Every structure is written in C-alpha cells, then in structure tokens.
Design a protein around this nucleic acid. Structure first.
Lengths: 237, 18, 47, 243, 179, 84
RNA sequence: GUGCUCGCUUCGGCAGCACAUAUACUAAAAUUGGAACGAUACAGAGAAGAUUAGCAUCCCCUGCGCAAGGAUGACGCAAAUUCGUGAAGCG
RNA sequence: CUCCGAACGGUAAGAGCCUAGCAUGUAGA
C-alpha cells in the first residue's frame, strides 16, 4: 500500500561511512505506528554497528517531520515532543551526532551470566543501565505522538535550569553591540578593547543583562559567528 | 537530493573496506 | 432479473432528455418528464 | 486476430471468435452497462467504455484489467483508439472530452469544447487534426495536444454516430433521421438528406445510431433506429456543384 | 463581492484572478474585476487584465467597453494601437464605420485617408454593405471637396442594381448639391 | 507495448545510488558530500505465505487539476422558445 | 595461504611481486502481556394479533470459489411576474 | 452378475461463575 524509492533517513541513522550498502524490500514488516505495508530497507551504519532498519513508514514520517527509523528529526535532531512544545532548539541541538545509537543492544545471555559466544558476541558486553529512571521505559507510539515522553520533559527542563565577551575580529563593531544592548536597556560605562578583540558592558542592576547572560552562553549569534563569552571580575581585582 | 549512479563495484567496495 | 432493462431504459431516456429537449435553456424539471413517460408506458400498456 | 468483439447493456464484453462461432473470452469486470468497445491499431488490447463512472482497458487473451481510466463525471458514450494518432481518446457525456495516456493511465489533456453532450468520435482517413461530433456546435480537434481547427455546420439535431472515409467525405448521423454530409477540406454541406421510414415504423421514429463506410470506400452503410439496415451507393452525376 | 466589501484587497484580487483563470468564458467576473480596477488606481495591472480579457476572444460589447475606458483615460496612441486587432476579428458594418474614430478627435487626415483606403480595399468590393458610402460622403461633406463628387458618382461599380437607395438618392443629391 | 506488458506482469503477480545529504549534514560526520551507498533487492524465497489478506494503504490524494472547460459562454435561446 | 623473483641467500630469517577481497533476520532471544458456547448450576422456543405481496438505486464470517449460504444503515429544497441597485454601450 | 457416492440444507436461543494450546521480537535514553 506504500512503496517508495529512497528512505527519508537521518544523517546519524545512515552512519559514519560515506559508502554504505542498503537492501530494499518491497512490502515488508508492517509500519510500527500506523499499521501499513511499506518498503523496509536495512543497512550497516558502520563497522561493529547495529544493522539498523526502517520502522516508521514514508507517509507516517513525512507528515509529522521525522526520520523513518529514530523519530527524532531531519532538520534538527531533537525529539518530536521538544520540537512541538518548544528558537531554543538551535542552541539545544548538537552537531557531530553520537553513534551511541547505532551500537548493539545488551547481550541478555551475558546479563543472565553465561554468554557462551565468548569474545565472539556480536552483541555488546556492558551492564544494563538500571530500570528506575523513565529513560528505561519509553516506547514508540508515545514517543511518536507528542503525548507522554520520558525524554522530552527531561530535555525540556534542561531548557530552564541554567561580562567578558570576545571574538570581535571585523564583524562585531561598537555601535551594533550597543544597539543590541539598547533593546535590553541603558548603559553606565561601555568600552571596546582591540588587543584582545573584546567588549565590556554593564547595566544599572544587571537583570536585563541577566537575560543577556541567557542570550550569550555560546548562543548569541550575530554577524555569523559563535561568540566567546566568559565571566568578568565584578570584584575590583 | 538523491539520484542514481553506475559506479565502479570494485572500487566502491574497496573504499568501503579501507 | 428484469431490473437492468428498467434501469437502462430510464437512464437512456434521461441521457436523451439531458442532451436534447430544452435545446438552449429549459429542462422542465426532471421527474415530471419521466412521469409523463411512465404514464405513456402505462397508456400503451392499456391496450 | 481472427475474432470479433461485442459489448452491450448486459455488463459483459464477449469476444465472439469466428473459428467456432462461440464465446471465447466472456470478459467481465464492469460495474454497469457497456457503451462501446474498440481495439488498438497495433497493440493487442481493447478499450471498453462503461456507463457507471469510467471506461475499462481489457487485455486480450488475459481477461485482466490493465488500467482503469476514470476521468469523466458521467457515462463514456464513445471511445476511439489509434497506433500513434491519439493513443486513447474517450468521449464523455458530461459535456467534456478527455484524452488519456495508455502508459501512465492518468488523464493527459481535456477539451475546450462541447456544451451539448458529445457522443461521436471517429479517426481521420489521411493525416492528423481529426474532428469530433456532438449535438450542438460540433468542432474539430488536433492530434498533437488538441487545437480547435474549425466548427461544423448548423446541425442542431442530436447526433449519434459520425463516419468519414479516406476520400475526404464526412457524414454525421443524427437521431432525427436526417443525415448531414460534409467535407473534410472545407466542411460544406453536400447532401443533407433525410432517410425514409420503414413500413412497420412510425411517422417520426427513424434515427441513425450507427454508420460505417465499407472497406472499398465506395458504398456507405447506415444503421437506423427503424429496424432496417440501408446500403447507400454513389451516384454518377455531374450537375451537382455546391453553391 | 464579499471579499471586495471587506478591507482585504490582496485576497480579493487573488480570488478575482482565480475566477478569471478558471472561468474564462464568464463575463460577469471580468466586469466585476474591471469595476474593482476602476475603483482602484490606474496601474498597469488593470491594462494587463483588460488585455487578458481581450485575448480570450471577447465580444463587441467588451471591446467597446475597453475602447470607452481607454478614451476616458486620455489615451491617444494606446487607443489607436489597441484598435488594430478589433477590426480584424469582427468585420461588421458597425465596426467598419467606427474604425475611423480618430477623425472625431484631432481630424487625423493621414489616418482618415488610410482608413478610407483600408475600407475601399476590404471585403465588399461589389456591394459595400450599403453603409460605407454614406459615411464616406458624410466625411467628405464635413471636410473639403477633395473626393466628394468622385466617390458618390464615379464609384458606382460597387452598387446593387439601382445605384442608390430608395429614400437616400434625392437626399444624397441635395447633400452633394448644396455643399 | 512495454508499458502494457509491465502492467500485465503486475496484474499477473498481484491477482548504486548517490544522494547528497543536503538537509542537516554540515559538520556532524564530516566528509559526507555525496553519500555513495548501494541499494540491492532482497531475494524473497518462493515458499512463503502472503503478508496479509486486507489492508488500508492510502496511495495518494484525490485532489486533481480542476481547470475550466473553456468551451463556450452560457446564454438563453428566446423568450418564446422557453415557453415552447 | 600457494607460487615466483638466476631476490638478500642460506636453506633460518627477511624483503618484493603475482594470485586470493567483505559472511551474518549475528544474540542459547533479553523482555512483554490474551482469548472456548468447557463443565456446572438455574431456568427453558414463553400459554396468541387488522395489513395485502414485494424487488432494487454499504461491510464482516463460513467456503478451494468467477457455486452458494450466513449478518447488517431517503422531506423543504421551490423553471421563473413587478420594482430598486451597480456596470457596459448608443444619440 | 460385482457401478462402492460425500458435504451443506442439522443439533439452538442465554443468563452468573471457572480454566486453557497460542502470537509480536522493534526506534527511544
């Protein structure tokens, strides 16, 4: 009921290898979250990887903006709950996507105690990360819908828990920085130093500059550059 | 953006192994 | 049974009365002309 | 092939062969009655127009539905095929024409004519830019993507079948008994004669519902609604100039 | 009308363009778009919509409305350039006598001579539809007597069996005598 | 004829690749500009039952190109022909 | 791994070269949770009926079915007079 | 004298309680 040509895959789900080998299967395995026949193709993401496959069908994933086998995203890399309830996502995402997803899951013969395959276990010989946290407990359908994620609340509270600015060069100038501070409020004493390519700004009672501390934790992206920010003295040292 | 190809089998697999 | 004859004969009169009859902008209702036709069928049935 | 094909209001397309004079295929699959059927000029397939919502393309010697061309909103009255002329050409009774592609199955291009229900389509006997037939304002078309070449004469009667020969003569049969002949190069009315009724027929009951020329293109044969098949021949006259 | 009654003009124009592209044979939607363009400014989009309506093979009532809208906008060259394809589509007697409309504005002598040569070289070399000769005689009587006696008496090769009309022979004689 | 033969084969059976990841791949797994991968077909053994007996696979959308007819304009014949 | 370099050159080692080029639903599955017209028991087609036939214009089950048999869901929509409004076009 | 038949058209109608042979093999952190 649903054939295609190429999978809508991730960039990490494909693998850390520029040449992989897919294997199309016309009408296999019955899509996880809509129960429809679709075109399953698996591959090997890299050496000693997990032989990843394709779960969520073409219309299933294309409609809801999500990858066919991890349900995170093609545009960002966040879950489908964070990218719906929550912008903040751009500083919340990551480049260089960890290949801790494409690895074999835990050898249950080892967990019981007698993994007979010895060193030849094509599974993975670590200990099972304890059951108690709800990141032992997520499923597919609750993940794929926005309703009830164990991950998305735990990453959504990373989004609200947690001055020497430099990296000026030839893009940042003094008037652009003081007008980007002018929307926050008024100055008391500002300066720009060019031997270290840095700027010093203050505020009446911080606060407004406090959300600048929310704005500039490797996050204030003006003039196409990730600016460098660490703390000032505030101690007359 | 996907498209077909008619690429060298031997060198494809060789670079993969490498 | 005989029902296909009836359905065919009514629909062909429908197609013809769609195409011709009005000849411009008339089409006097619909059921009315079919009713006059049905009464005619009974009239020829009347021997 | 050495066989004939028949279809009608019995919702069955029978391929009556000539080697044994019996039903050899007895194909089925139409949801309602069938209007017409015709075979391709080179391919061994047949396109059948049904009445429910679409036409059917049936493959010979397989009895399987190849492709369903559902592009009309009413019954498909006439359907014409060709080797490379217009591939698939189906005339619909929903006051619109549609010519689909036999490979893809979807509709390719639709017509810019025929407010009256069009029920007469026929192939050309020379080159391209063939014409169609309808009850009011019959026009012409073109094989490459369609183009309104010219309109017909003042034939306001409900036409049922149009037949043209390779000599350039075109004749359209109406349901009122009057058969109006025209030309292919100009389009002038040549005879526009009316057919007489039979002895058992009524006063106004004859209607030309089918017309096809012979293989020699010299003797014409028209089928009327008065239960009589008339054979028309030529006339060796010379004082018949058109004004 | 519901979109034009509100303050939305972009969605109203987008609905009008879709109605004009879907219904090309309709004339009420084109008249409503022309009224909305006359209620709006004099931008080139109204002229483009008028050209798109005229390119869809309209009737003479739309061509006359477009000519009136061009004449009511102080257009001389644009009205004369758009009048070339109007006589080539409908060669009526009312359209041939209205093709020489430049004489009624600036008296357009070279244009009137070209229109007279085009009217004499058009269809009707044997009958002239009994309407071009009276208009040519009126245009010669309003102007000087250059070719007023020639086209009325020596141009009788395009007459129909009586060289004049029944009630227009003595009237033409009195118009040629007392002028 | 080739299209009809393919359609008849489908009715009888019924009744490498180079894709550039130009979506999010910029620095994560650096070096993927063409992503040369091979896509083969799985050899299905001819001793197997069908996957199901019924399904509800939505193939496509029913929205077609509803363009205008552009045949002619609409009018009326006569006042007396309307009553006739 | 096999063979060959009048390889270094003894018969040990080392070097060069040729040939030989990508298995695998890899886990002893880790997990994970449903239904019988069963027996028993009580009871037992209720101790009846004014419409008169009917037949067509959305699914699951039994069945080898292009045999068959099972279970199911419509009225208001109005063809055409008089008057006012907007626009095109004419004298 | 030696030509042998099979199924459907057939077991009701349910009330409260009680017990069973199976089936999928997942993305997640």
């Amino acid at each position: 009921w649903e054939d295609a040509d190429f999978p809508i895959l991730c960039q990490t789900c494909l693998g850390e290898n520029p040449y992989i080998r897919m294997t199309k299967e016309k009408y296999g395995k019955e899509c996880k979250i809509c129960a429809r026949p679709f075109t399953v193709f698996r591959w090997c993401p890299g050496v000693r990887m997990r032989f990843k496959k394709t779960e969520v069908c073409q219309t299933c994933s294309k409609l809801k903006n999500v990858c066919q086998t991890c349900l995170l995203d093609l545009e960002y890399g966040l879950p489908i709950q964070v990218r719906d309830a929550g912008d903040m996502l751009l500083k919340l995402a990551r480049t260089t996507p960890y290949y801790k997803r494409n690895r074999p899951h835990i050898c249950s013969f080892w967990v019981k105690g007698e993994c007979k395959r010895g060193e030849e276990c094509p599974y993975r010989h670590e200990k099972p990360t304890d059951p108690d946290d709800p990141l032992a407990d997520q499923n597919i359908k609750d993940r794929y819908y926005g309703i009830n994620d164990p991950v998305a609340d735990k990453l959504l509270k990373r989004a609200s828990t947690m001055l020497y600015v430099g990296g000026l060069g030839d893009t940042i100038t003094e008037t652009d920085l003081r007008n980007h501070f002018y929307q926050f409020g008024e100055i008391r004493t500002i300066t720009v130093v060019q031997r270290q390519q840095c700027a010093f700004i203050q505020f009446a009672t911080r606060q407004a500059a406090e959300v600048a501390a929310e704005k500039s934790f490797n996050k204030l992206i003006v003039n196409g550059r990730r600016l460098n920010v660490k703390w000032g003295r505030s101690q007359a040292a | 953006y996907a498209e077909p190809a008619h690429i060298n089998d031997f060198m494809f697999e060789q670079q993969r192994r490498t | 049974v005989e029902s296909h004859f009836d359905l065919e004969l009514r629909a062909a009169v429908m197609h013809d009365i769609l195409d011709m009859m009005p000849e411009g902008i008339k089409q006097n209702k619909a059921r009315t002309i079919l009713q006059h036709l049905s009464e005619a069928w009974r009239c020829w049935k009347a021997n | 092939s050495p066989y004939l094909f028949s279809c009608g209001e019995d919702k069955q397309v029978k391929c009556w062969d000539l080697e044994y004079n019996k039903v050899i295929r007895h194909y089925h699959g139409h949801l309602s009655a069938v209007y017409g059927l015709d075979l391709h000029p080179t391919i061994d397939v047949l396109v059948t127009c049904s009445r429910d919502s679409t036409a059917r393309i049936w493959d010979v010697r397989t009895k399987a539905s190849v492709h369903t061309l559902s592009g009309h909103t009413n019954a498909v009255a006439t359907v014409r095929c060709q080797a490379a002329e217009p591939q698939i050409i189906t005339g619909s009774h929903d006051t619109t024409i549609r010519l689909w592609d036999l490979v893809a199955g979807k509709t390719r291009v639709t017509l810019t004519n025929h407010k009256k229900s069009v029920r007469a389509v026929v192939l050309h006997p020379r080159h391209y830019t063939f014409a169609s037939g309808s009850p009011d304002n019959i026009k012409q078309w073109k094989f490459p993507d369609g183009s309104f070449i010219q309109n017909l004469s003042g034939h306001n009667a409900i036409i049922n079948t149009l037949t043209v020969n390779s000599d350039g003569v075109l004749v359209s049969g109406a349901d009122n008994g009057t058969m109006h002949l025209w030309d292919w190069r100009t389009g002038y009315n040549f005879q526009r004669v009316h057919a007489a009724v039979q002895p058992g027929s009524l006063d106004s009951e004859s209607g030309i519902f089918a017309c096809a020329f012979d293989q020699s293109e010299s003797r014409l044969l028209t089928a009327e609604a008065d239960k009589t098949i008339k054979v028309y021949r030529e006339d060796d006259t010379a004082t018949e100039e058109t004004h | 009308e519901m979109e034009m009654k509100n303050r939305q003009v972009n969605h109203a124009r987008n609905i009008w363009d879709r109605a004009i592209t879907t219904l090309p044979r309709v004339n009420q939607f084109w008249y409503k778009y022309t009224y909305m363009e006359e209620m709006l400014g004099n931008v080139a989009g109204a002229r483009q919509v008028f050209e798109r309506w005229m390119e869809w093979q309209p009737e003479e009532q739309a061509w006359h409305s477009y000519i009136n809208f061009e004449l009511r906008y102080k257009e001389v060259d644009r009205a004369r350039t758009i009048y070339e394809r109007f006589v080539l589509v409908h060669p009526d007697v009312k359209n041939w006598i209205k093709y020489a409309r430049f004489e009624e504005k600036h008296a357009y002598f070279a244009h009137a001579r070209k229109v007279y040569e085009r009217a004499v070289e058009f269809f009707g070399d044997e009958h002239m539809d009994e309407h071009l000769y009276v208009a040519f005689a009126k245009f010669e009587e309003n102007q000087k007597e250059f070719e007023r006696v020639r086209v009325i008496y020596k141009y009788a090769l395009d007459r129909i069996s009586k060289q004049d009309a029944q009630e227009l022979f003595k009237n033409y004689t009195i118009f040629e005598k007392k002028f | 004829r080739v299209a009809l033969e393919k359609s008849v084969s489908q009715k009888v059976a019924a009744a490498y690749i180079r894709y550039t990841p130009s979506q999010q791949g910029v620095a994560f797994n650096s070096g993927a500009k063409q992503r040369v991968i091979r896509m083969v077909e799985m050899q299905k053994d001819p001793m197997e039952p069908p996957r199901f007996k019924i399904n509800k696979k939505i193939p496509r959308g029913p929205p077609s190109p509803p363009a205008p007819v552009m045949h002619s304009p609409s009018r009326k014949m006569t006042v007396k022909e309307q009553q006739e």
